[PDB]
DNA sequence: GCTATTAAAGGGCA
DNA sequence: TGCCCTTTAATAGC
């Protein structure tokens, strides 16, 4: 399904749930184990748990993010979790319209780029300026996906909100890395 | 750390 | 009315 016979590695995911239920965050930030709560500094109650990894944040309209989770299955499962502490807290939350919102994958070509060629190459897309950033900045437009493309061979892959856009974004780019090769 | 990338949620402010 | 606020994760040159 890979023709490059690389895989990425899923890094991180995002995603989102409605807990269908106005929260007292006040009440939840003094009730709860793991959680900080500084309004003049963000409007959520950030959270976390060990397993899945993750972190949640958590607003009083009952919307809470979920990040740091190594599959769409883990974020899933992850957010469960935080919808049933809040639950124990006294609160009728629910676990309305979860959907995964970013996906971000890394991989290793095992080759060096020559990304000033590249960028070259491919204005349209890319995006290279080394004396603020390393990695050339490549927006590919199908999928609508940003890779971020490393003179060592690593490639960062973010933006998805599906596993497939990732993959089939490597698949595209790397035909590309390949004809830029550092020799 | 910090630079940049991406995505969501909200309060605050020009 | 945009845009930042925070969180996360990979990357690498400050």
């Known amino acids: 399904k890979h023709p490059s016979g690389i895989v990425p590695t899923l890094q991180n995911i995002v995603s989102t749930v409605n807990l ?9 930030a003094l009730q709860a184990r793991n959680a900080e709560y500084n309004p003049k500094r963000f ?3 950030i959270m976390r748990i060990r397993e899945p990894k993750t972190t949640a944040l958590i ?12 599959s769409e299955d883990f974020s899933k ?4 979790k935080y919808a049933r ?4 807290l006294g ?8 959907k995964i919102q970013n996906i971000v994958g890394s991989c290793d070509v095992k080759f060096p780029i020559r990304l000033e060629g590249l960028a ?5 897309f890319s995006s290279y300026e080394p004396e603020l950033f390393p990695g050339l900045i490549y927006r590919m437009k199908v999928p609508k996906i940003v890779l971020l493309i490393f003179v060592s ?22 035909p590309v890395l390949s004809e830029f090769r550092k020799i």
Do not use: W
Not at 65 to 70: D, I, L, P, Q, R
């Open 20 to 28: 269908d239920c106005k929260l007292d965050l006040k009440a939840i």
């Open 43 to 45: 409007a959520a109650v």
């Open 59 to 70: 607003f009083a309209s009952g919307k809470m993010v979920c990040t740091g989770a190594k």
């Open 77 to 80: 499962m992850a957010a469960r």
């Open 85 to 88: 502490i809040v639950q124990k």
């Open 91 to 98: 609160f009728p939350a629910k676990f309305k319209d979860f």
């Open 120 to 124: 070259y190459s491919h204005a349209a």
């Open 153 to 174: 061979g690593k490639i960062v892959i973010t933006g998805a909100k599906m596993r497939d856009e990732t993959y089939k974004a490597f698949e595209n780019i790397y």
